Amino acid sequence: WVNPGYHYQYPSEGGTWRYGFVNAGLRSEYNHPTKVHGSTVQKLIDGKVDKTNRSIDTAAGRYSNAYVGAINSPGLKGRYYYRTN
Ligand SMILES: [Cl-]
Ligand SMILES: [Cl-]
């Protein structure tokens, strides 16, 4: 199970990174105001990777969108990634 709602980090590279269990999925979303950027999320069940979703290379000023639809079940955990180009 994942304590729901976006969690936030502020990369040294710039921008805002938000991720977590939100609106029926695991999500990783990164906004960089000027650079091409992206994000990735992995869905874990009992520690095993069930799915990986990688955002496309995303335009400056928009949040990248990495998502896996999920039930917030007892075995659910997420792992989250961001990138700049
Ligand atoms: Cl990424
Ligand atoms: Cl695995």
From TrEMBL:
The keyword Transmembrane helix applies. Keywords: Membrane, Transmembrane, Transmembrane helix. This is Lactococcin 972 family bacteriocin. It comes from Bacillus licheniformis (strain ATCC 14580 / DSM 13 / JCM 2505 / CCUG 7422 / NBRC 12200 / NCIMB 9375 / NCTC 10341 / NRRL NRS-1264 / Gibson 46).
